[PDB]
């Protein structure tokens, strides 16, 4: 069964959606914001949650043993966004390191390309599960990629005018529209995650 | 004392009250630390002013009496031979403390060597001889209008934050926690009311339901 | 913000002459005009001064700083505070033979309060 209450006004407030917390599982809030926006999935990844996680890595783990651990440091980068996000426009973005603003910047592209999508599109209509597997690897290992090339020493500014390129890769990687090869697509994206690697190597130099 | 929305507002009240703290006290210690790196720019540009001021005219007086010594006084020629500047002036850009600096830099411009001033003679090496102790001061007087310009730059940003908490703190806060305590007496109404018509409904049907049955013993 | 590229002085005969032989004042060629003026004590009127302040401060933004003896800025002291922009920086040093004065600096009197 898949239940849907209905806002009364105020967020939560009302009885029937605490009584409806009290024994549903899986809870898939609302957000304001996102509507305003018109950013058409609302989800909100604050107070949303699901308790089949902790099973469902059974399965997981017979087909995609990633998806826990790189879930998580998903979740992790959008909450440390988010609470970066709290204080920066009380003041501005002037005094941070080259890893806030990296940390920022992924979280900004995670939001407007992987949360993003209209079911209105050919390409966009279902998101297959390893297409979603592919498209969050290659968001994560380019995130991570950028936090060790600046560790090691560097400026980020400059680096960014070099990574523009696999930066428009990754945010069109999306358009890659499934039911082609179901198969060719993971090796186009392989492809795109060595090319991706190859690329900050040369323009680490 | 505020505009009144009354409906169930008070999470986003609380939410605002928080965020007025926690910008209070971090624009409290961004004012003390520019305070404090303020006093040093103060200290340092008062003594190296005040230094420049002799060391310039040792350096000068010295150069006008190599220049009296030779009995020539090249003046006219370094007043009419010159044709282009040795030194250039470049933006620094610096963040001292959270504010970025648009500070000034001592860009030497050796493009131009220096000055064909040699040649008379017995004044010939004088001259350059004293152009360098002459050309000492320029880098003190440079570091002396970066520190100017700090100090101006540290002085505005300073006063304009310390207003600015002054401000939140003296009317932000009491403005909504005023509304706060409005919307709490409210919604402490209310409920009241509404346990006085319950308690209306109830005491009707428990005295006819006791009349009807009262009768009922016959 | 690198418009501001030369330095111009308002000082006597002796240091003028010094400065540009060392050289920071340019005749500019583009412009055929010294941004760097030699004062003569008791013959330029104040209102020459003020104008070439003028010109080095809104007309001829090429000038970064405008140095000028303290004696000499003291007889321009109102135009010397009136203009308080930091953009353009302005530094106050002592005349020929004339000692430190601190009075004639508008920067430090301004430093000497709310301190």
């Known amino acids: 069964i898949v239940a849907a209450v209905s806002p009364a006004g105020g967020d939560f407030s009302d009885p029937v959606t605490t ?10 809030g609302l957000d304001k914001k996102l509507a305003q926006r018109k950013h058409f999935p609302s989800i909100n990844t604050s107070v ?56 920022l910047d992924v979280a900004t592209l995670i939001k407007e390309d992987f949360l993003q999508q209209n079911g209105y599109s050919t390409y966009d209509a279902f998101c297959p599960i390893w297409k979603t597997f592919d498209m969050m690897r290659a968001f994560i290992s380019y995130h991570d990629e950028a936090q060790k090339a600046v560790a090691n020493g560097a400026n980020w500014s400059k680096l960014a005018d070099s990574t523009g390129d696999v930066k428009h890769a990754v945010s069109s990687s999306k358009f890659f529209e499934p039911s082609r090869g179901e198969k060719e697509v993971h090796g186009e994206f392989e492809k795109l995650l060595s090319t991706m690697q190859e690329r900050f190597a040369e323009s680490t130099d | 004392e505020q505009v009144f929305p009354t409906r169930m507002t008070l999470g986003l009240m609380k939410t605002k009250l928080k965020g007025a703290n926690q910008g209070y006290s971090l624009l409290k210690r961004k004012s003390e630390a520019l305070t404090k790196r303020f006093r040093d720019i103060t200290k340092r540009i008062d003594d190296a002013k005040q230094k420049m001021g002799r060391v310039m005219q040792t350096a000068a007086f010295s150069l006008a009496e190599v220049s009296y010594a030779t009995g020539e006084n090249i003046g006219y020629q370094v007043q009419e031979s010159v044709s ?11 963040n001292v403390s959270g ?71 003296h009317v932000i806060i009491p403005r909504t926690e005023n509304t706060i305590a409005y919307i709490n007496s409210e919604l402490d109404e209310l409920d009241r009311e509404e346990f006085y018509r319950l308690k209306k409904v109830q005491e009707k049907k428990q005295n006819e339901t006791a009349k009807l049955d009262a009768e009922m013993k016959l | 913000a690198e418009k501001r590229t030369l330095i111009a002085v308002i000082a006597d005969e002796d240091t003028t002459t010094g400065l540009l032989l060392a050289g920071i004042g340019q005749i500019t060629p583009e412009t055929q005009e010294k941004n760097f003026f030699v004062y003569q004590e008791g013959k330029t009127t104040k209102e020459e001064i003020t104008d070439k302040f003028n010109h080095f401060t809104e007309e001829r933004d090429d000038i970064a700083i405008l ?31 004339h000692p430190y004065d601190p009075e004639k600096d508008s920067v430090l009197k301004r430093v000497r309060k709310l301190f």
């Open chain 1, 19 to 28: 009584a409806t917390l009290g024994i549903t599982q899986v809870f898939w």
């Open chain 1, 48 to 103: 949303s949650y699901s308790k089949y996680t902790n099973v469902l890595n059974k399965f997981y783990d017979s087909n995609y043993p990633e998806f826990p651990v790189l879930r998580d440091r998903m979740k992790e980068i959008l909450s440390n966004a988010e609470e970066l996000e709290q204080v920066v426009q009380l003041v501005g973005k002037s005094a941070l390191s080259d890893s806030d603003k990296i940390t």
């Open chain 2, 84 to 94: 282009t500047a040795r030194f250039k002036v470049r933006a620094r850009q610096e």
């Open chain 2, 99 to 169: 504010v970025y600096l648009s500070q000034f830099e001592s860009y030497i411009d050796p493009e131009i060597n220096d000055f064909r001033l040699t040649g008379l003679g017995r004044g010939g090496q004088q001259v350059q001889r004293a152009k360098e102790i002459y050309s000492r001061a320029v880098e003190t007087l440079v570091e002396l209008a970066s520190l100017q310009t700090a100090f101006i730059i540290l002085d505005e940003v300073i006063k304009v934050t310390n207003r600015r908490v002054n401000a939140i703190e």
């Open chain 3, 67 to 97: 140095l000028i003896n303290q004696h000499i800025a003291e007889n321009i002291r109102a135009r010397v505070d009136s203009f308080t922009n930091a953009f353009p920086a302005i530094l106050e040093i002592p005349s020929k033979d």
